[PDB]
Amino acid sequence: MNIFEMLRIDEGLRLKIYKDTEGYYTIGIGHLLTKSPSLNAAKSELDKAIGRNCNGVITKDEAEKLFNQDVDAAVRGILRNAKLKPVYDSLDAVRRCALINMVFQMGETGVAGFTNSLRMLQQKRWDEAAMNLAKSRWYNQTPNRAKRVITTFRTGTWDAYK
Ligand SMILES: [Cl-]
Ligand SMILES: [Cl-]
Question: Which fold has domain 1-162?
Fold first, then answer.
């Protein structure tokens, strides 16, 4: 198992513009296009991201390209973030993937706001951090996915995904 496989399971793959769980226009493997209510704005953002007239549809290849970009951006973002970097540095390989997952989903900023949880992960207090992570909007809105990420942090293994 690796980050790509992990995220492919949590996000799915769709080749046509769709609304995410929060109602935002998205495509491919969890690639947010926009938070605007306008399908056109979405369609516009899409073409700009692909560089062609897409008419709201893309190919698999294109979906995978956006995915590679997004994963790279997430890692780089973590590594640039004063709050995130130290946490990342302190973790083992598996749990690092869990932190990338959260960043991909919620943004650097979003994750950086899980102050208490971050401190606990940094102190290697697995069970405590898991419980704290659970007390969040995130957990309440997408519980199955949250639970998978949380178990990953708790155990340090890929069991939730197997
Ligand atoms: Cl809560
Ligand atoms: Cl879910």
Answer: Lysozyme (1.10.530)
Active site residue 20: yes
Q: By what method was this entry solved?
A: X-ray
Q: How far is the CA of 30 from the centre of ligand 2 (A)?
A: 13
The residues spanned by each domain of the chain are 1-162
The Cβ-side half-sphere exposure at 157, using a 13 Å CA radius, reads: 4
45 has catalytic annotation: no
Count the Cβ atoms, other than its own, within 10 Å of residue 134. Answer: 15
- Cα(161) to ligand 2 centroid in Å equals 13
**Rounded distance between C-alpha atoms, residue 137 and residue 16, angstroms:** 28
Q: How far apart are the first and last CA of the chain?
A: 9
**Secondary structure, 3-state, 65-111:** HHHHHHHHHHHHHHHHCCCCHHHHHHCCHHHHHHHHHHHHHHHHHHH
